[PDB]
Amino acid sequence: SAIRVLKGLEGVRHRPAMYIGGTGVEGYHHLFKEILDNAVDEALAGYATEILVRLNEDGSLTVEDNGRGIPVDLMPEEGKPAVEVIYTTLHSGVGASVVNALSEWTVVEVFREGKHHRIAFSRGEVTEPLRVVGEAPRGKTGTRVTFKPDPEIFGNLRFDPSKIRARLREVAYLVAGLKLVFQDRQHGKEEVFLDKGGVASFAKALAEGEDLLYEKPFLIRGTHGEVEVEVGFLHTQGYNAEILTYANMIPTRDGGTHLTAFKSAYSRALNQYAKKAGLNKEKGPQPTGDDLLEGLYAVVSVKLPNPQFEGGKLLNPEAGTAVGQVVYERLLEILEENPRIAKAVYEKALRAAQAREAARKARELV
Amino acid sequence: SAIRVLKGLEGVRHRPAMYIGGTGVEGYHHLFKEILDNAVDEALAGYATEILVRLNEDGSLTVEDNGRGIPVDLMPEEGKPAVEVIYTTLHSGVGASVVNALSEWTVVEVFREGKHHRIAFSRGEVTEPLRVVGEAPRGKTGTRVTFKPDPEIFGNLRFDPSKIRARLREVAYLVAGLKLVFQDRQHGKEEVFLDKGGVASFAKALAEGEDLLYEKPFLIRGTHGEVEVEVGFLHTQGYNAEILTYANMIPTRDGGTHLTAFKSAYSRALNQYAKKAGLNKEKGPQPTGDDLLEGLYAVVSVKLPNPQFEGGKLLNPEAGTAVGQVVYERLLEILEENPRIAKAVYEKALRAAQAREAARKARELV
């Protein structure tokens, strides 16, 4: 047929690394991350509140949400249900279709409009067309996708529960209040990932083993233009700063305009508060750049429509504007609402400046 | 404001007869029929299975369905929820907005996405903007509209329960299996209108007081092009034919192309069956036009996108084609499946022709 070419799922099978990076352990897990990303988008939309990830006895993986359920409604242009189109077409749901193409089999179940639908595929093709298999409970809506990556592409590879667990933990911190459940039905473990603290609880976890300046982390949230900003932080009693940055749920190891803006707005807000609170001293050493960040453990998580990167690092000057505005404003309020912490944090910055000035004087003695 | 003019609900109040025909008993009840028509369209779409019509103690009327519930989602163009737009704008839900404009007050409640929403209006204007008033039961979806026609427009008029009951009975026959409940909370009666027999049960009710040729009515259903065809019928032992015709749920008293096609297809199908069954005699009087319709009590109900009328009568040559194709085909099958009835029906037609031929001969004797 000419449709196999137009649907380009055969092209996914010939050139899989173009879609999943490779056919080793990482490419195998990108199939998982893609399915999860579709279930997560449903939580971000405000419909799904909990996600199940189940590693089955046969090595297959089930991803399920309690969202709206993939529309089963017949698309007029294609003359096929929306669920079928999304899983069989690259040129129209790209991610879902790549998983279908590269899996020996895929079963898509949809609980929608009081009905339980089921569609099955193998290597990109329909093996069972959409059909009502029964009634869904009165208030039950959602999607249940089960898939088995193709051994003709990946050989003897299998899912790694520690890699699944790491991603679910990250997602539970990036999407505050979303419950993600992991059931390993190959080894027998069952874990829950739920943190209403979000990026603030993530910042505290990043400080594990450290002496905390204060036990409860702070959370900054807000939107400026097309850029959505989320910041979690606390301080340790240490002198290093540790700032993890994310752009659209993926780690940005080389920072960018969101990191630069966070550091500037943070420093500006602390300086402004100290001035207004009378914490700053007239003479002596004044806390500069790094001084104002000592002991800071923070997580900066942004959402942008068209992000620009090298290779990593973020270039969007819009991201720099949005992080700046949201952080400066809310941090001023935090410091004001928690003057004991605010004073402890500024004192730390003052002591770093004092110790450097003391070290400079000791250098004269040589 | 300039919006009152653009929303044209003030224009409805100045010229109500342009929308509801008049400001007497009939115009007052057209407010009811319009709200019901919107709830009925939801049943036709396949979402609502039961409709409640409740005449309240205060003279207000509640219309409720178990459908999808009017979308509460914010329309981007207007920057207002869809429910608000539909009830406040003529130039974009025409019927709903006319009811709002001509009612002293209107309360629109929507059970959707696990939430119970409420919006209130008075004479076209919002008195209470859309707001979540509580949670809806897990599987509860639908719309509840309560309204009180404006005494500043209608004076001392009130709803007539017999007029409400007549419309609900008609709707229960035109929409086979739809349950419509009428609760008169002014007088104390409670009636149910549900008939899975549809237009066939309607045809039998039309024959009340008559001796039936057969007790169980027949139902013909089908679609040809843009025209949907529904026919219910039975025969009496009488010599008159009674054919009620409808186009898009409203009675067509002067018939049209749907009546013409029904009569032609019916006669053709009966003639064709008699030929094939060997019921027709070679010599003697052959049943003609009216002969083939004697004792026929039928209901012909069609659905068209652009119907053409005089003043009543239907002109659409498409309607004539669709009634013709659906009836001829299914009636041939009915006669074949019920040869005892088929033979009784044709015999009746033969006896009418025989009696006329006997009357012609008696005329020679003078």
Side-chain angles (χ1 to χ4, degrees), chain A residues 1-90 93-366, chain B residues 1-90 93-366:
Chain A
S1 297
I3 60 112
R4 274 189 181 187
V5 167
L6 284 147
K7 284 188 173 183
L9 294 206
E10 209 180 57
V12 173
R13 292 192 54 85
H14 286 212
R15 292 246 95 178
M18 196 143 76
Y19 299 95
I20 56 161
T23 53
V25 159
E26 306 299 320
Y28 197 95
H29 289 80
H30 283 138
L31 304 176
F32 146 66
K33 293 177 208 174
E34 182 52 41
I35 297 301
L36 181 62
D37 288 343
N38 290 297
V40 160
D41 277 347
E42 197 54 16
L44 294 173
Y47 298 97
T49 66
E50 49 202 282
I51 295 164
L52 171 69
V53 181
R54 186 206 304 136
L55 178 62
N56 304 310
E57 299 88 346
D58 71 335
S60 75
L61 190 75
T62 299
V63 180
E64 181 168 5
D65 69 45
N66 60 351
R68 287 172 293 183
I70 297 174
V72 294
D73 17 298
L74 196 75
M75 273 167 97
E77 279 164 49
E78 292 79 20
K80 304 251 73 203
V83 199
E84 182 177 349
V85 178
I86 292 152
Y87 278 83
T88 56
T89 74
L90 209 66
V94 181
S97 75
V98 165
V99 171
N100 178 14
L102 306 178
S103 294
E104 178 158 46
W105 60 262
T106 308
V107 181
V108 179
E109 297 167 84
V110 177
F111 305 91
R112 209 176 142 97
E113 292 152 54
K115 307 143 191 159
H116 176 195
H117 309 80
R118 182 187 151 122
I119 182 155
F121 316 90
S122 173
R123 301 179 171 98
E125 300 275 309
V126 176
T127 47
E128 295 159 44
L130 186 79
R131 73 167 195 110
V132 171
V133 291
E135 232 66 24
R138 301 319 165 253
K140 197 193 177 176
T141 55
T143 306
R144 179 163 72 210
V145 173
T146 309
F147 73 97
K148 178 75 171 126
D150 194 9
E152 298 186 339
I153 294 147
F154 306 99
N156 50 254
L157 300 171
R158 288 196 274 146
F159 293 106
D160 183 341
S162 79
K163 289 175 133 280
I164 295 165
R165 287 188 289 99
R167 182 59 183 167
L168 297 185
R169 186 181 164 102
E170 183 174 58
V171 168
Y173 291 135
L174 291 167
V175 188
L178 171 70
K179 188 159 98 116
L180 301 105
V181 175
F182 180 54
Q183 310 180 315
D184 180 345
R185 300 183 94 106
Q186 247 172 272
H187 306 111
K189 314 275 102 175
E190 190 172 296
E191 193 170 347
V192 177
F193 307 89
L194 165 96
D195 216 315
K196 299 168 206 72
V199 290
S201 286
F202 197 174
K204 177 159 178 173
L206 213 53
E208 178 189 351
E210 304 292 309
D211 283 319
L212 304 174
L213 188 71
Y214 51 89
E215 193 124 326
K216 200 191 200 286
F218 289 109
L219 179 66
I220 300 164
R221 304 169 72 118
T223 308
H224 178 258
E226 290 159 61
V227 190
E228 193 172 303
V229 178
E230 208 173 75
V231 175
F233 75 93
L234 82 179
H235 290 78
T236 69
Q237 284 176 46
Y239 316 140
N240 63 317
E242 296 297 321
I243 312 149
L244 237 67
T245 58
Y246 286 89
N248 287 73
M249 319 258 312
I250 63 101
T252 53
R253 275 96 191 188
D254 284 311
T257 46
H258 54 340
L259 178 57
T260 290
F262 172 62
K263 285 164 81 165
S264 293
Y266 184 92
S267 290
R268 280 183 281 118
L270 191 46
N271 236 69
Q272 175 68 16
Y273 172 81
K275 279 223 158 196
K276 172 258 155 186
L279 296 183
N280 66 310
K281 202 181 173 179
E282 292 132 53
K283 294 176 179 180
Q286 276 264 144
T288 62
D290 282 11
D291 291 342
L292 289 175
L293 301 165
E294 274 196 15
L296 180 66
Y297 277 58
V299 177
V300 191
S301 164
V302 301
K303 297 187 214 291
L304 272 112
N306 292 97
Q308 294 293 329
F309 312 93
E310 50 154 43
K313 195 171 188 172
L314 194 121
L315 202 74
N316 310 63
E318 323 101 72
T321 309
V323 182
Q325 200 251 44
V326 169
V327 172
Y328 187 76
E329 281 189 56
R330 193 54 189 117
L331 186 52
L332 276 186
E333 289 187 332
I334 291 299
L335 301 175
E336 279 192 272
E337 281 152 26
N338 305 269
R340 292 196 68 181
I341 288 161
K343 191 188 170 266
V345 170
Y346 192 74
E347 230 139 47
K348 233 198 168 298
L350 255 169
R351 285 196 303 278
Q354 285 163 5
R356 183 176 64 253
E357 184 53 17
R360 186 189 68 84
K361 295 174 181 155
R363 185 68 67 170
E364 277 184 319
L365 187 43
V366 60
Chain B
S1 297
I3 60 112
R4 274 189 181 187
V5 167
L6 284 147
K7 284 188 173 183
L9 294 206
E10 209 180 57
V12 173
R13 292 192 54 85
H14 286 212
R15 292 246 95 178
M18 196 143 76
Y19 299 95
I20 56 161
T23 53
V25 159
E26 306 299 320
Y28 197 95
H29 289 80
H30 283 138
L31 304 176
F32 146 66
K33 293 177 208 174
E34 182 52 41
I35 297 301
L36 181 62
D37 288 343
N38 290 297
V40 160
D41 277 347
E42 197 54 16
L44 294 173
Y47 298 97
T49 66
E50 49 202 282
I51 295 164
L52 171 69
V53 181
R54 186 206 304 136
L55 178 62
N56 304 310
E57 299 88 346
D58 71 335
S60 75
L61 190 75
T62 299
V63 180
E64 181 168 5
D65 69 45
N66 60 351
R68 287 172 293 183
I70 297 174
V72 294
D73 17 298
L74 196 75
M75 273 167 97
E77 279 164 49
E78 292 79 20
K80 304 251 73 203
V83 199
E84 182 177 349
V85 178
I86 292 152
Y87 278 83
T88 56
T89 74
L90 209 66
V94 181
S97 75
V98 165
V99 171
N100 178 14
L102 306 178
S103 294
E104 178 158 46
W105 60 262
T106 308
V107 181
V108 179
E109 297 167 84
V110 177
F111 305 91
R112 209 176 142 97
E113 292 152 54
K115 307 143 191 159
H116 176 195
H117 309 80
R118 182 187 151 122
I119 182 155
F121 316 90
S122 173
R123 301 179 171 98
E125 300 275 309
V126 176
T127 47
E128 295 159 44
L130 186 79
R131 73 167 195 110
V132 171
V133 291
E135 232 66 24
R138 301 319 165 253
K140 197 193 177 176
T141 55
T143 306
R144 179 163 72 210
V145 173
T146 309
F147 73 97
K148 178 75 171 126
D150 194 9
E152 298 186 339
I153 294 147
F154 306 99
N156 50 254
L157 300 171
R158 288 196 274 146
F159 293 106
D160 183 341
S162 79
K163 289 175 133 280
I164 295 165
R165 287 188 289 99
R167 182 59 183 167
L168 297 185
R169 186 181 164 102
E170 183 174 58
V171 168
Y173 291 135
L174 291 167
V175 188
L178 171 70
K179 188 159 98 116
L180 301 105
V181 175
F182 180 54
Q183 310 180 315
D184 180 345
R185 300 183 94 106
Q186 247 172 272
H187 306 111
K189 314 275 102 175
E190 190 172 296
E191 193 170 347
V192 177
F193 307 89
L194 165 96
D195 216 315
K196 299 168 206 72
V199 290
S201 286
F202 197 174
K204 177 159 178 173
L206 213 53
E208 178 189 351
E210 304 292 309
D211 283 319
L212 304 174
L213 188 71
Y214 51 89
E215 193 124 326
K216 200 191 200 286
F218 289 109
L219 179 66
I220 300 164
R221 304 169 72 118
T223 308
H224 178 258
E226 290 159 61
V227 190
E228 193 172 303
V229 178
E230 208 173 75
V231 175
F233 75 93
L234 82 179
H235 290 78
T236 69
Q237 284 176 46
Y239 316 140
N240 63 317
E242 296 297 321
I243 312 149
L244 237 67
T245 58
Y246 286 89
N248 287 73
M249 319 258 312
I250 63 101
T252 53
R253 275 96 191 188
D254 284 311
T257 46
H258 54 340
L259 178 57
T260 290
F262 172 62
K263 285 164 81 165
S264 293
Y266 184 92
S267 290
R268 280 183 281 118
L270 191 46
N271 236 69
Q272 175 68 16
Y273 172 81
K275 279 223 158 196
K276 172 258 155 186
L279 296 183
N280 66 310
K281 202 181 173 179
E282 292 132 53
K283 294 176 179 180
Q286 276 264 144
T288 62
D290 282 11
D291 291 342
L292 289 175
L293 301 165
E294 274 196 15
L296 180 66
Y297 277 58
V299 177
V300 191
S301 164
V302 301
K303 297 187 214 291
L304 272 112
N306 292 97
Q308 294 293 329
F309 312 93
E310 50 154 43
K313 195 171 188 172
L314 194 121
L315 202 74
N316 310 63
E318 323 101 72
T321 309
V323 182
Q325 200 251 44
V326 169
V327 172
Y328 187 76
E329 281 189 56
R330 193 54 189 117
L331 186 52
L332 276 186
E333 289 187 332
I334 291 299
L335 301 175
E336 279 192 272
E337 281 152 26
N338 305 269
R340 292 196 68 181
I341 288 161
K343 191 188 170 266
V345 170
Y346 192 74
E347 230 139 47
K348 233 198 168 298
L350 255 169
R351 285 196 303 278
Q354 285 163 5
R356 183 176 64 253
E357 184 53 17
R360 186 189 68 84
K361 295 174 181 155
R363 185 68 67 170
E364 277 184 319
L365 187 43
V366 60

